[PDB]
Amino acid sequence: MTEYKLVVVGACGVGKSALTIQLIQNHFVDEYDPTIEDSYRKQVVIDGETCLLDILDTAGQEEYSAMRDQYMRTGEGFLCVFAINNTKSFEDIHHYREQIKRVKDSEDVPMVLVGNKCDLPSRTVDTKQAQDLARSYGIPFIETSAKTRQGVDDAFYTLVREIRKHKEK
Ligand SMILES: Nc1nc2c(ncn2[C@@H]2O[C@H](COP(=O)(O)OP(=O)(O)O)[C@@H](O)[C@H]2O)c(=O)[nH]1
Ligand SMILES: [Mg+2]
Known part of the structure; x- marks a missing residue:
């Protein structure tokens, strides 16, 4: 019954999308429309806690910016x-880090x-470059492959553990 909104x-x-579908359905999707935004849910056990993951797979701009803020x-x-393999996507992390902190108006976001x-x-x-950025943010860095499943559970489960640490303070 504890739910985590990811x-x-x-x-x-x-x-x-490939990462989310690998986590939820345990298969690698070759083709999934880049413009589809949807949420998925699944029951998992993480460190002995039975919990519900409610995962939003985002697709970028929204019809109205209020939807993004929401x-x-x-x-x-x-x-x-x-x-x-895409340096621009790495550079864009700066933008997402900032925008999330801005909307939530908080310095500490899991x-x-x-x-x-x-x-x-x-x-x-x-x-090394990615570890340097994660160190500057004080957050974990995980390398994944949605195709082979390497690191996929670790990425999502680590995020849940980060939420738990935030909540206990
Ligand atoms: N080889 C490989 N291809 C991937 C991986 N993850 C996604 N892809 C491919 O990269 C493309 C974009 O993936 P997608 O999940 O649609 O990206 P999104 O726009 O971030 O949702 C697709 O053709 C996927 O098959 C991966 O870990 N390894
Ligand atoms: Mg997608």
Whole structure:
């Protein structure tokens, strides 16, 4: 019955939908419309706690900006995703970090930084660069592949653990 409201954000094409569908349905989707924004739910056990994950797979601009503000305010934790072969997507993390803090009007928002597509040979963002950014934010960094499932549970479960740490204070 404890529910965690998770929000997946990041530039178009980084694997937000693929990561979410891998977590929920345990398969890799080759093709999922980049413009579809939807929420998914699943019951999981995390550190012995049976809980419900309610995950919003975001798709960018909204019909009205109030819709963006609404999901950022109600969201409890944010998975900030870039792709390791797309430097622009890594640079865009700065924008998402700032915008979420701005809407929530808080310095302390549970977040995890995710470098997806680590199964690919092409890499433009080395691990050190991403670790340096995560260190500056004081948040965890996890490399994932939605295709092989590497790191997928860890990314989402770590985010839940970050929410728990925020709530106990
Ligand atoms: N090789 C590989 N491809 C991926 C991975 N994650 C996503 N993709 C592919 O990257 C493209 C964009 O993924 P998508 O989930 O639609 O990204 P979104 O726009 O962030 O929702 C799709 O063609 C996916 O098949 C991954 O971890 N490895
Ligand atoms: Mg998508």
